[PDB]
Enzyme design. Structure first.
Site, mmCIF file in Angstrom:
data_model
loop_
_atom_site.group_PDB
_atom_site.id
_atom_site.type_symbol
_atom_site.label_atom_id
_atom_site.label_comp_id
_atom_site.label_asym_id
_atom_site.label_seq_id
_atom_site.Cartn_x
_atom_site.Cartn_y
_atom_site.Cartn_z
ATOM 1 N N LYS A 227 14.762 9.056 10.476
ATOM 2 C CA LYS A 227 14.432 8.336 9.260
ATOM 3 C C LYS A 227 13.336 9.090 8.490
ATOM 4 C CE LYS A 227 12.831 3.775 7.563
ATOM 5 N NZ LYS A 227 12.495 2.338 7.914
ATOM 6 N N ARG B 47 15.035 11.772 6.507
ATOM 7 C CA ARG B 47 15.725 11.225 5.342
ATOM 8 C C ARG B 47 14.679 10.806 4.260
ATOM 9 N NH1 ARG B 47 16.618 5.907 4.417
ATOM 10 N NH2 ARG B 47 16.637 5.326 6.640
ATOM 11 N N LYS C 56 11.046 0.821 -2.235
ATOM 12 C CA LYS C 56 9.921 1.344 -1.478
ATOM 13 C C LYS C 56 8.931 1.680 -2.594
ATOM 14 C CE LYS C 56 9.260 4.335 2.646
ATOM 15 N NZ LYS C 56 8.054 5.194 2.574
ATOM 16 N N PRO C 57 7.733 1.073 -2.574
ATOM 17 C CA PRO C 57 6.650 1.252 -3.556
ATOM 18 C C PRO C 57 6.174 2.687 -3.791
ATOM 19 C CG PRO C 57 6.181 -0.547 -2.052
ATOM 20 C CD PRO C 57 7.272 0.257 -1.440
ATOM 21 N N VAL C 58 5.884 3.400 -2.708
ATOM 22 C CA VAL C 58 5.408 4.777 -2.821
ATOM 23 C C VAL C 58 6.011 5.582 -1.668
ATOM 24 C CG1 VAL C 58 3.371 4.410 -1.419
ATOM 25 C CG2 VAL C 58 3.331 6.204 -3.140
ATOM 26 N N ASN C 59 6.446 6.809 -1.963
ATOM 27 C CA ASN C 59 7.098 7.673 -0.977
ATOM 28 C C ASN C 59 6.921 9.156 -1.320
ATOM 29 O OD1 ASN C 59 9.110 7.821 1.314
ATOM 30 N ND2 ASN C 59 10.175 9.024 -0.241
ATOM 31 N N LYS D 97 -4.443 6.034 8.659
ATOM 32 C CA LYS D 97 -5.011 4.997 7.801
ATOM 33 C C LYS D 97 -5.103 3.691 8.584
ATOM 34 C CE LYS D 97 -2.445 5.195 3.850
ATOM 35 N NZ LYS D 97 -2.191 5.352 2.361
ATOM 36 N N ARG E 299 6.103 7.089 -7.038
ATOM 37 C CA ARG E 299 5.437 5.812 -7.080
ATOM 38 C C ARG E 299 6.160 4.947 -8.082
ATOM 39 N NH1 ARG E 299 1.578 7.462 -6.537
ATOM 40 N NH2 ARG E 299 0.158 6.640 -4.923
ATOM 41 N N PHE F 180 2.852 -3.966 29.555
ATOM 42 C CA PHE F 180 2.947 -5.255 28.870
ATOM 43 C C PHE F 180 1.488 -5.662 28.630
ATOM 44 C CE2 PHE F 180 5.572 -8.907 27.725
ATOM 45 C CZ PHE F 180 4.612 -9.848 27.495
ATOM 46 N N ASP F 181 1.043 -5.531 27.382
ATOM 47 C CA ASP F 181 -0.313 -5.846 26.929
ATOM 48 C C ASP F 181 -0.629 -7.351 26.941
ATOM 49 O OD1 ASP F 181 -2.780 -4.604 25.303
ATOM 50 O OD2 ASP F 181 -2.164 -6.370 24.124
#
Lengths: 124, 124, 124
Positions: free
Chosen positions: A7, A10, A41-44, A66, A85, A120-121
């Site tokens: 992905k 792509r 998608k807002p920003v790529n 981030k 954007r 398993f947390d």
């Protein structure tokens, strides 16, 4: 089921081109790579470098993501990229984008492929 | 030498069942999944969902891990689980558990498979 | 392209030797392992243990890495290792090292194999 590595290619790899061909580049790319299939998608960002080059970044400068995860790496040198954007008027299914070319270092998050459960947390 | 991924399956996956079918479910499962052989594991939870569903959690919401690593992910939706907690009188070789069936979001720690040494950090 | 796993085995694994077999061991090893091809690597350690023994550490005690990353682990047992520090007189292409045998716990940083990009975090 496309893997996350697949992905990423792509959504962010565009090795056949050296820069954005025009101001409409992001409108044509966001659409052809299916990043506007059920939402905009807002920003790529698309990287105009070879896949080998982007993959080698997982062995370069480690930086926190981030979101705080410690699997992000910054490229040693600058690379040609195009930010896409969504414009102010864009509204699914009429996604519209502004194209911004640049040459900067990139930061990518890396993971093993596959990436599976090993502890398993908790349950919340 | 069982891989960490296979060990998570033995310790946390119970796909063939929709929920604990009885209060003795834990005494039976902790024993049959070999969690009482080396000592009485204090607490353990089993997830009653498909291997595919649990594996997909590694790509869901990143959240803080109790141990501080940055590889924990919380499931977007709740799953049917069975918490097994050692009873007050449980003591090896007579391990005994309290069974509590529930519906909660699960948080699992993820890792590549294989997961190998790549840098020598230090000696101590 | 040598894998990161492969580069670790080449720069830090010396399974065929229980310990430094001479005080000229680092001078020989640093050369035979190509850590002197372009420049003389300042410091480097070799672990006199099997590969499996070292790979097993990726499942042991998680401790922070020198750079803050959370993918480091410390061995439960001490190990036969050799530190190679470059002597102040050393000047490429004449690489002189001081060998130093030791029995210490090792700390290694671990990753999946392959380890690839999965998110585009930012451009700086």
């Amino acid at each position: 089921k496309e893997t996350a590595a697949a992905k990423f290619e792509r959504q962010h790899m565009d090795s056949s081109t050296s820069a954005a061909s025009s101001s409409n580049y992001c409108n044509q790319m966001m659409k052809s790579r299916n990043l506007t299939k059920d939402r905009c998608k807002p920003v790529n960002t698309f990287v105009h470098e070879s896949l080998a080059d982007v993959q080698a970044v997982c062995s370069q400068k480690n930086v926190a993501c981030k979101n705080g995860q410690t699997n992000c790496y910054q490229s040693y040198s600058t690379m040609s990229i195009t930010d896409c954007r969504e414009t102010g008027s864009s509204k699914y299914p009429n996604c519209a984008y502004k194209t911004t070319q640049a040459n900067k270092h990139i930061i990518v998050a890396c993971e093993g492929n596959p990436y599976v459960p090993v502890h398993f947390d908790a349950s919340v």
